[PDB]
Design an enzyme around this catalytic site. Structure first.
Site, PDB file in Angstrom:
ATOM      1  N   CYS A 120       0.791  -1.219   0.000  1.00 24.68           N
ATOM      2  CA  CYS A 120       0.000   0.000   0.000  1.00 24.68           C
ATOM      3  C   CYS A 120       0.837   1.291   0.000  1.00 24.68           C
ATOM      4  CB  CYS A 120      -0.891  -0.003   1.236  1.00 24.68           C
ATOM      5  SG  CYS A 120      -1.812   1.509   1.462  1.00 24.68           S
ATOM      6  N   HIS A 139      -1.775  -3.426   5.824  1.00 27.89           N
ATOM      7  CA  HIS A 139      -1.194  -3.055   7.099  1.00 27.89           C
ATOM      8  C   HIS A 139      -2.207  -2.408   8.023  1.00 27.89           C
ATOM      9  CE1 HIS A 139      -0.564   1.357   6.022  1.00 27.89           C
ATOM     10  NE2 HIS A 139      -1.002   0.802   4.910  1.00 27.89           N
ATOM     11  N   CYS A 183      -4.182   1.892   8.124  1.00 32.97           N
ATOM     12  CA  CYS A 183      -4.168   2.132   6.689  1.00 32.97           C
ATOM     13  C   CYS A 183      -5.093   3.281   6.399  1.00 32.97           C
ATOM     14  CB  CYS A 183      -4.631   0.902   5.920  1.00 32.97           C
ATOM     15  SG  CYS A 183      -4.475   1.164   4.174  1.00 32.97           S
ATOM     16  N   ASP A 208       0.249   4.051   1.649  1.00 33.09           N
ATOM     17  CA  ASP A 208       0.349   4.652   3.009  1.00 33.09           C
ATOM     18  C   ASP A 208       1.525   4.095   3.767  1.00 33.09           C
ATOM     19  OD1 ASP A 208      -2.354   5.636   3.007  1.00 33.09           O
ATOM     20  OD2 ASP A 208      -2.960   3.731   3.887  1.00 33.09           O
ATOM     21  N   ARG A 219       4.608   2.732   5.807  1.00 35.99           N
ATOM     22  CA  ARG A 219       5.737   3.579   6.191  1.00 35.99           C
ATOM     23  C   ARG A 219       7.067   2.825   6.233  1.00 35.99           C
ATOM     24  NH1 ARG A 219       1.877   5.196  10.554  1.00 35.99           N
ATOM     25  NH2 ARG A 219       3.551   5.435  12.131  1.00 35.99           N
TER      26      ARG A 219
END
Ligand SMILES: [Zn+2]
Ligand SMILES: [Zn+2]
Ligand SMILES: [Zn+2]
Ligand SMILES: [Zn+2]
Lengths: 215, 215, 206, 206
Positions: free
Chosen positions: D27, D83, D86, D29, D31
């Site tokens: 994804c 994750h 999200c 987003d 990190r």
């Protein structure tokens, strides 16, 4: 005033008028037709064929964008499954899409779609740029049809059908409401090599301008 | 035998036959029509309207896929720019797309496109699964039209046109070649709240089955 | 398999042994994460990676990321990052028919044709790298021509577009010189960049 | 700006101070890079990241990556990785109209509806995480239903699909239990996974 009611009323008397005239109510398709969403005479009438023998996709400015899942899968289905041996890309005169494509105003989401017409413009910009501005739209509509045929011919689907010895011909026409005639734009491919020659020859022909519109 | 020549010949005598009858050769569109690529009677004829008053998109199984750039931008252009106040999703009987959607065989790229019809099937699977198998295709064609209207109504484009007080109504019909009639599937939206009620009510109505096709 | 069970071990041991301000449109081949090569703190990067770091006009996936980035996340910098030894760019330049991916790569091939005179007076081995750079400047240009970025500028939003290439060989990012903070600046720097790329050094000439 | 000039400094100093076997659909987003959390060697990962780690049936971008991965790169493992926290999944669950991205997220909302009974007997704060897991199992299922992966299996190619979630909170990947090496195994494990997710623990119940 209400427009939906009129449509339903027109539908009813149409069906009733057909059943009065005969028993108007299987047929396999023979052409894939790729046309423009704002053209107004339909393909089935314009080409005066038997109903059912055209498989029809219509989008704005009649495009075959390399990565358009909609059109691509239509082409893939026509060729691989329905075994249609002709795909026709039909443009037309007084085309709204091309006009929206050329006007500067941002119209929103659709501009993104029309950016592919703009790349085409800038690709033939030397040609279009020595044309008097008021005629550009008419040429861009023609060149557009030439480029979309070329796009179609370069899709993995078409190349693969040609490689495995399948009969498949591609055509690019422009419908002119002003005389009812379908006019060939010159790009006609039955193979990768006919695609290149035909396209190149077509752009070369289109690039010769009438003296009264040049600098 | 050659099929392209016949098409050109038919085109010519058509145009010549029209010009003989009158002076058949501006008009603003009033409906967006979203129809199926394998339907065979055209919208303009079927609905017997004036040419030019339908803006037409046709894809396989007449879908409004949430993320289809082609259809979405067409809808965005119709609503935001052309200011069409009616979008119509028209399905039809004996629909090839729906049939390809239900048959198991992998047909290639197009199956990916048709996977959205399959999710719809499995969404109403309890309904379709208590239906005798030979009737499923006919119901799925109807439910499909219901779901695509709902999809259209949930697009950001439509919600936004409703939010800013723009007049926009959505319709979902099925064309039946067997009698020439357009049949309403019951999902009719002029707002987010009409969309929900109408859709829900429509699925509830479709879910009541004829006794002779159940377990 | 073992590979997978190895993956989990490696993660489990890595765990024991232990809002975003940029949109990063990088390539799926690249081997060094943006977060690493930039030495940014975790969460500063909001990332999209596709084949050949492309901003195709009509790709819903990438266009969605950009819109979400700009309109909702309110990010003020979008970086497009090509790289050297890009398997996508090489794939796009081969004659080989690879199936579906070819249609995706046709957009790159249209770029190759567009700058074909330039690439045609270049040495064969050095073409992939030129196309990789040209590609970056072209995707930036494409980004700047989206309705999304154009509305953002139009409406006064602070937004800056960047086009860099990351050379594996030495780890250094090199700006490709197309950098837009408006539509007029986009034109000027795109054209400047192509003109800069068109001036060729002797040991790139054929 | 300064930020950007800072980016280059950070990279320049990071440089001085200094074929793939998996497809990773993660994804935008997230990190922590796949390469980091997996502790894989640089170049083992061939990566696609979009909003909410989606395999939309008709998305050319993602479908292209998969085809290139499977048919050309000959990768034998595709990992889909959701994750926790999200922002995409949260965005999809809000009522707020966000523009273009909403259309992208409608696919997630269709998922939410599809398992709405399950999510409806869950506690509000715990729903995003359930949907995040459900989402992973659904994208794996979607991947396994592509013509690409189905032809690959059909023709005898060694290909395995995986669906994991990475929890920021502790760095551990957790398999969501849908794992396919064929079409029949895809069915069985997808259904098993949903059935596992449907059995609810007391402190998730509303
Ligand atoms: Zn037109
Ligand atoms: Zn049909
Ligand atoms: Zn690359
Ligand atoms: Zn996320």
């Amino acid at each position: 005033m209400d427009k939906i009611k009129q449509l339903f009323a027109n539908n009813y008397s149409w069906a009733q008028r057909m059943k009065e005239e005969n028993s108007t109510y299987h047929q396999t398709p023979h052409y894939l037709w790729i046309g423009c969403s704002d053209s107004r005479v339909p393909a089935e009438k314009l080409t005066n064929l038997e109903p059912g023998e055209l498989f029809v996709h219509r989008n704005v400015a009649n495009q075959v964008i390399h990565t358009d899942f909609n059109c691509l899968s239509v082409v893939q289905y026509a060729v691989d499954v329905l075994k249609i041996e002709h795909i026709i890309i039909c443009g037309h005169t007084n085309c709204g899409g091309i006009h929206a494509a050329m006007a500067d105003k941002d119209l929103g989401l659709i501009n993104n779609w029309l950016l592919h017409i703009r790349d085409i413009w800038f690709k033939h910009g030397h040609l279009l740029g020595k044309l008097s501005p008021e005629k550009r739209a008419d040429m861009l509509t023609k060149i557009n049809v030439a480029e979309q045929v070329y796009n179609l011919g370069r899709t993995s689907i078409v190349k693969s059908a040609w490689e495995r010895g399948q009969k498949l011909s591609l055509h690019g026409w422009v419908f002119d409401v002003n005389d009812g005639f379908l006019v060939d734009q010159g790009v006609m491919a039955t193979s990768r090599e006919t695609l290149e020659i035909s396209y190149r020859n077509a752009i070369a022909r289109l690039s010769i301008l009438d003296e009264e519109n040049i600098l």
